[PDB]
Design an enzyme around this catalytic site. Sequence first.
Site, PDB file in Angstrom:
ATOM      1  N   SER A  29      65.927 -58.735 -26.617  1.00  0.00           N
ATOM      2  CA  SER A  29      67.277 -58.157 -27.354  1.00  0.00           C
ATOM      3  C   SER A  29      67.637 -57.439 -27.110  1.00  0.00           C
ATOM      4  O   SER A  29      67.739 -56.347 -27.144  1.00  0.00           O
ATOM      5  CB  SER A  29      66.508 -58.914 -28.529  1.00  0.00           C
ATOM      6  OG  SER A  29      65.592 -57.445 -28.678  1.00  0.00           O
ATOM      7  N   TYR A  31      73.733 -56.933 -27.121  1.00  0.00           N
ATOM      8  CA  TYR A  31      74.251 -57.983 -26.992  1.00  0.00           C
ATOM      9  C   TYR A  31      73.498 -60.114 -27.274  1.00  0.00           C
ATOM     10  O   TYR A  31      74.742 -60.478 -27.410  1.00  0.00           O
ATOM     11  CB  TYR A  31      74.598 -58.012 -25.095  1.00  0.00           C
ATOM     12  N   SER A  33      70.005 -61.933 -28.511  1.00  0.00           N
ATOM     13  CA  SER A  33      69.091 -62.384 -28.010  1.00  0.00           C
ATOM     14  C   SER A  33      68.903 -63.322 -27.041  1.00  0.00           C
ATOM     15  O   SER A  33      69.313 -64.655 -27.192  1.00  0.00           O
ATOM     16  CB  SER A  33      68.604 -62.933 -29.613  1.00  0.00           C
ATOM     17  OG  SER A  33      67.956 -61.719 -29.991  1.00  0.00           O
ATOM     18  N   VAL A  34      67.241 -63.259 -26.027  1.00  0.00           N
ATOM     19  CA  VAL A  34      66.687 -63.618 -25.487  1.00  0.00           C
ATOM     20  C   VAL A  34      65.124 -64.623 -25.380  1.00  0.00           C
ATOM     21  O   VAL A  34      64.437 -64.141 -25.658  1.00  0.00           O
ATOM     22  CB  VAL A  34      67.413 -63.313 -23.828  1.00  0.00           C
ATOM     23  CG1 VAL A  34      66.562 -64.338 -23.104  1.00  0.00           C
ATOM     24  CG2 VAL A  34      68.915 -62.867 -23.552  1.00  0.00           C
ATOM     25  N   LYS A  49      70.375 -67.709 -23.564  1.00  0.00           N
ATOM     26  CA  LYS A  49      70.476 -66.320 -24.425  1.00  0.00           C
ATOM     27  C   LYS A  49      71.997 -66.789 -25.153  1.00  0.00           C
ATOM     28  O   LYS A  49      72.627 -67.592 -25.189  1.00  0.00           O
ATOM     29  CB  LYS A  49      71.553 -65.285 -23.482  1.00  0.00           C
ATOM     30  CG  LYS A  49      71.950 -64.084 -24.433  1.00  0.00           C
ATOM     31  CD  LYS A  49      72.663 -62.576 -22.970  1.00  0.00           C
ATOM     32  CE  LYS A  49      73.806 -63.485 -22.229  1.00  0.00           C
ATOM     33  NZ  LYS A  49      74.438 -62.687 -21.463  1.00  0.00           N
ATOM     34  N   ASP A 160      73.877 -59.847 -13.999  1.00  0.00           N
ATOM     35  CA  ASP A 160      74.226 -58.475 -14.571  1.00  0.00           C
ATOM     36  C   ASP A 160      75.970 -57.800 -14.046  1.00  0.00           C
ATOM     37  O   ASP A 160      75.728 -56.517 -14.321  1.00  0.00           O
ATOM     38  CB  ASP A 160      72.705 -57.456 -15.397  1.00  0.00           C
ATOM     39  CG  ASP A 160      71.983 -58.001 -16.182  1.00  0.00           C
ATOM     40  OD1 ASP A 160      72.507 -59.760 -16.856  1.00  0.00           O
ATOM     41  OD2 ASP A 160      70.989 -57.043 -16.113  1.00  0.00           O
TER      42      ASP A 160
HETATM   43  O1  LIG Z   1      71.814 -61.081 -20.607  1.00  0.00           O
HETATM   44  C1  LIG Z   1      70.428 -61.455 -20.365  1.00  0.00           C
HETATM   45  C2  LIG Z   1      69.397 -61.267 -20.521  1.00  0.00           C
HETATM   46  C3  LIG Z   1      68.941 -61.771 -19.707  1.00  0.00           C
HETATM   47  C4  LIG Z   1      66.795 -61.637 -19.929  1.00  0.00           C
HETATM   48  C5  LIG Z   1      66.447 -60.453 -20.308  1.00  0.00           C
HETATM   49  C6  LIG Z   1      64.855 -59.788 -20.898  1.00  0.00           C
HETATM   50  C7  LIG Z   1      63.820 -61.133 -20.284  1.00  0.00           C
HETATM   51  C8  LIG Z   1      64.587 -62.421 -19.298  1.00  0.00           C
HETATM   52  C9  LIG Z   1      66.211 -62.259 -19.613  1.00  0.00           C
HETATM   53  N1  LIG Z   1      69.578 -62.954 -19.293  1.00  0.00           N
HETATM   54  N2  LIG Z   1      69.868 -62.743 -20.234  1.00  0.00           N
HETATM   55  C10 LIG Z   1      70.969 -64.299 -19.504  1.00  0.00           C
HETATM   56  C11 LIG Z   1      70.756 -65.202 -19.986  1.00  0.00           C
HETATM   57  C12 LIG Z   1      71.638 -66.418 -19.590  1.00  0.00           C
HETATM   58  C13 LIG Z   1      72.655 -66.074 -19.681  1.00  0.00           C
HETATM   59  C14 LIG Z   1      73.043 -65.148 -18.449  1.00  0.00           C
HETATM   60  C15 LIG Z   1      72.431 -63.966 -19.065  1.00  0.00           C
HETATM   61 MG   LIG Z   2      70.468 -54.703 -16.640  1.00  0.00          MG
END
Ligand SMILES: O=C1CC(c2ccccc2)=NN1c1ccccc1
Ligand SMILES: [Mg+2]
Length: 342
Positions: A29, A31, A33-34, A49, A160
């Site tokens: 987390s 922007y 939480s995931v 997310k 990203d």
């Molecule tokens: O912005 C992030 C950050 C992220 C992530 C963080 C930690 C562990 C595993 C994945 N996944 N995401 C994302 C998830 C869905 C769509 C677009 C981006």
């Molecule tokens: Mg990054």
Amino acid sequence: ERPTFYRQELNKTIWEVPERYQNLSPVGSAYGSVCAAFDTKTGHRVAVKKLSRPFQSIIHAKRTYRELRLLKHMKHENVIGLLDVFTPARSLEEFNDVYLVTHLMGADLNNIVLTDDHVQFLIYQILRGLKYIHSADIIHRDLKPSNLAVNEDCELKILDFGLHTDDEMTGYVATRWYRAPEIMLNWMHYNQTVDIWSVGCIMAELLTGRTLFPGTDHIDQLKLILRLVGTPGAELLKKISSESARNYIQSLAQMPKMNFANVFIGANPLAVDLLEKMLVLDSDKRITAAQALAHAYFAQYHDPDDEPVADPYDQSFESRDLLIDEWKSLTYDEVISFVPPP
Ligand SMILES: O=C1CC(c2ccccc2)=NN1c1ccccc1
Ligand SMILES: [Mg+2]
Ligand SMILES: [Cl-]
Ligand SMILES: [Cl-]
Ligand SMILES: [Cl-]
């Protein structure tokens, strides 16, 4: 049409998601939480997310729309793609929450970071994805090892995209070590060539095991850069828009470009040649992604019939001035029109 949703509270947040997504477990987390989950429709482990306050200001609403537009467009083997997007809202009137779904990525390039064959394959895949990205007139802006996912078979995806605060870029920080000097110091209007500088920094680090330009601040980093590639000539000086930045550059004693074979000791001579063509101070003169794919260093992998380009991407919204609810309505339309991949 509409799936059934179920609710649960995970670490102080209410998540409402379609039944297809099971075994939600938090993994990270400002922007959002995931959660990691299992998608029973596709069989993949996925990342889900939940955006935090997606429409709290005009700036935030436009950023939400920007991220969704970009992720819906990207369809390439070496670029992150969108598996699903959803909202539990049944109408625009009650629309408040946005959820995005991608494949769950394991390790990034940091963990990996190697034979010369490994370096060839990893950098080939970065450039193949960049050729696609740049063909749509998109600039990534933030390429670095933590933004590259790599699996057990050495297959790589770019993630990203740059959608960064002054404090995030201050001091001895990896967030700045891969940035082109013209954007680090706001010398001039930048373009897609900034991404090629980043690839050179990444390639050097895979070859040596060490950060190429680990500056303790902006000025220390510039001094490290100019010691390797030389101080600017009058041709590049003319292109620096800031009179004060020009003045600072001319305060420094002149230095010649170094011999890269004596810096990258023992490396493949073709790798040294490619690095000299990426790490050029004048961005007009850097090699492009399409040109780099045809360099002899990649002769084992290059296939000009399997290096695709992107559909055209309309970013006219970026210069548009709209109200919060107008950005919110545009976002709602993009959620409900999403068509999943095959
Ligand atoms: O912005 C992030 C950050 C992220 C992530 C963080 C930690 C562990 C595993 C994945 N996944 N995401 C994302 C998830 C869905 C769509 C677009 C981006
Ligand atoms: Mg990054
Ligand atoms: Cl479902
Ligand atoms: Cl909602
Ligand atoms: Cl990094």
